[PDB]
Design a protein around this ligand. Structure first.
Ligand SMILES: *[C@@H]1O[C@H](CO)[C@@H](O[C@@H]2O[C@H](CO)[C@@H](O[C@@H]3O[C@H](CO)[C@@H](O)[C@H](O)[C@@H]3O)[C@H](O)[C@H]2NC(C)=O)[C@H](O)[C@H]1NC(C)=O
Ligand SMILES: *[C@@H]1O[C@H](CO)[C@@H](O)[C@H](O)[C@H]1NC(C)=O
Ligand SMILES: *[C@@H]1O[C@H](CO)[C@@H](O)[C@H](O)[C@H]1NC(C)=O
Lengths: 187, 106, 119
């Protein structure tokens, strides 16, 4: 803010963010990216953390190969996690009847909750890899885009405590609402 | 029901050498862990993720793997390296261990 | 972190046992397990208890005979197992279990263990 010309001044106005988010009648799912790698998505009560690397922790032979949201009930004991996972996959674009399925764990297994999707840019699943890349770009402002075109690349989502330093941005929330169709926000 | 076969059962190396331990599976396994045990004691975790060293292992131990076959490697071993090693996989329940390999110093 | 065990010994082939196993770590944020080592050096997992005692698992070789329950208030574990058999004579270890690596859930701090004999 300084004098420009002879009687005119140049000054700026910045809009608050915490008030708008805490003031909405419903609860909004918010996306965040901390440091330069750690992606985060917080729904109602699911504070999911997303990372990318070429580590295969799940295998098709011994797992649950989720193809439909009905089978998702066999993974977690809490409905909020199921809602968050299903709607995130719907928002990125995963129409469940024409696409490869994705792998999760049986709930009775004593190894927590986790879901992972392979998006390696190889011959097979190349189209799925590009579609997921576009979805990630649209759903995250400055996408780091790890696991460049090479041997392997698998994304993993796990439940962690929500960190109290994420910049509560709202562009990503708007894109999540726009891409996600028929998303029902509670409260 | 994944089964694990270790090779070889008995080792007798030289006071400072490079040794390898082979661990094959029945079916494909993604990740594998290595545990170490001394006679008259309890096993202690040594390698996790087939590539991650344990908290407090000298920088001469290493691991590798592919599909069904995994390997453990010691670059330059000393007398303290004379003990029993166990494979472990936790991909399909029940989690299964190896048959155990004993390594001794000549 | 330290762990102690008690309740082992010699029992007739057909009795029932209650084995007791923690200090140092809050242990309310860790999931634990019990494993067997036969007189020949062979290992096998027999009990696995989730951080919350809501989920508890045992394999076929102990299904219907081995149960494990943790008293969080005392930071202890009681494993009750009936129908003693000769093949179930071995060393028993109680071991912690935590995440080492963003995705790896592996056993930690295997305890001293106690001896169970059938004769
Ligand atoms: C996610 O997708 C990737 C895409 O690469 C999967 O890796 C691929 O796994 C297939 C399994 O059939 C490999 O095909 C075989 O590979 C070799 C030659 O590369 C050979 O054995 C056969 O001729 C056959 O082509 C494929 O190569 C492999 N891709 C790479 C780059 O190695 C990956 O497994 C998927 N992840 C999950 C969790 O399902
Ligand atoms: C993430 O950022 C926080 C806050 O600055 C920092 O303390 C932490 O070390 C960072 N972690 C990584 C892995 O960069
Ligand atoms: C584990 O969950 C899967 C997923 O549906 C199911 O098929 C399987 O029967 C479950 N395991 C047990 C032991 O019930």
């Amino acid at each position: 803010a300084f004098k420009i010309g002879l009687h005119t001044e140049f000054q700026t106005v910045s809009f608050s963010m915490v008030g708008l988010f805490s003031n909405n009648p419903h609860d909004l799912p918010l996306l965040c990216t901390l440091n330069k790698s750690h992606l985060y998505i917080k729904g109602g009560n699911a504070s999911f953390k997303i990372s990318f690397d070429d580590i295969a922790v799940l295998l098709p032979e011994y797992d649950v190969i989720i193809q439909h949201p009905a089978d998702m009930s066999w993974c977690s004991k809490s409905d909020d996690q199921i809602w968050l996972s299903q709607w995130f996959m719907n928002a990125v674009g995963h129409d469940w009847y024409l696409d490869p399925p994705f792998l999760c764990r049986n709930r009775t297994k004593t190894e927590g909750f986790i879901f992972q999707v392979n998006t390696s840019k190889t011959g097979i699943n190349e189209n799925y890899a590009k579609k997921f890349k576009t979805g990630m770009h649209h759903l995250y402002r400055e996408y780091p885009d790890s696991c460049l075109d090479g041997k392997l690349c698998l994304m993993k989502a796990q439940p962690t405590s929500w960190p109290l330093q994420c910049p509560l941005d709202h562009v990503n929330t708007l894109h999540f609402l726009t891409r996600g169709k028929n998303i029902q926000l509670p409260r | 029901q994944i089964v694990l076969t270790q090779s070889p059962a008995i080792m007798s190396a030289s006071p400072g050498e490079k040794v390898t331990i082979t661990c094959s599976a029945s079916s494909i396994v993604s990740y594998m862990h290595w545990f170490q045990q001394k006679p008259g004691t309890s096993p202690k975790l040594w390698i996790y993720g087939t590539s991650n060293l344990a908290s407090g292992v000298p920088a001469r131990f290493s691991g590798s793997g592919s599909g069904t076959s995994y390997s453990l490697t010691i670059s330059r071993m000393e007398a303290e390296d004379a003990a029993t090693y166990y494979c472990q996989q936790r991909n399909s329940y029940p989690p299964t261990f190896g048959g155990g390999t004993k390594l001794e110093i000549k | 972190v330290a762990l102690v065990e008690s309740g082992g010994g010699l029992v007739q082939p057909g009795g029932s046992l209650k084995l007791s196993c923690a200090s140092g770590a809050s242990f309310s944020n860790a999931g634990m397990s019990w494993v067997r080592q036969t007189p020949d050096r062979r290992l096998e997992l027999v009990a696995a208890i989730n951080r919350d005692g809501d989920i508890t698992y045992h394999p076929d070789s102990v299904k219907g005979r081995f149960t494990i329950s943790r008293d969080n208030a005392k930071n202890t574990l009681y494993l009750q197992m009936s129908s003693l058999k000769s093949e179930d004579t071995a060393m028993y270890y109680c071991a912690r279990e935590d995440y080492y690596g963003l995705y790896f859930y592996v056993m930690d701090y295997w305890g001293q263990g106690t001896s169970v004999t059938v004769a």
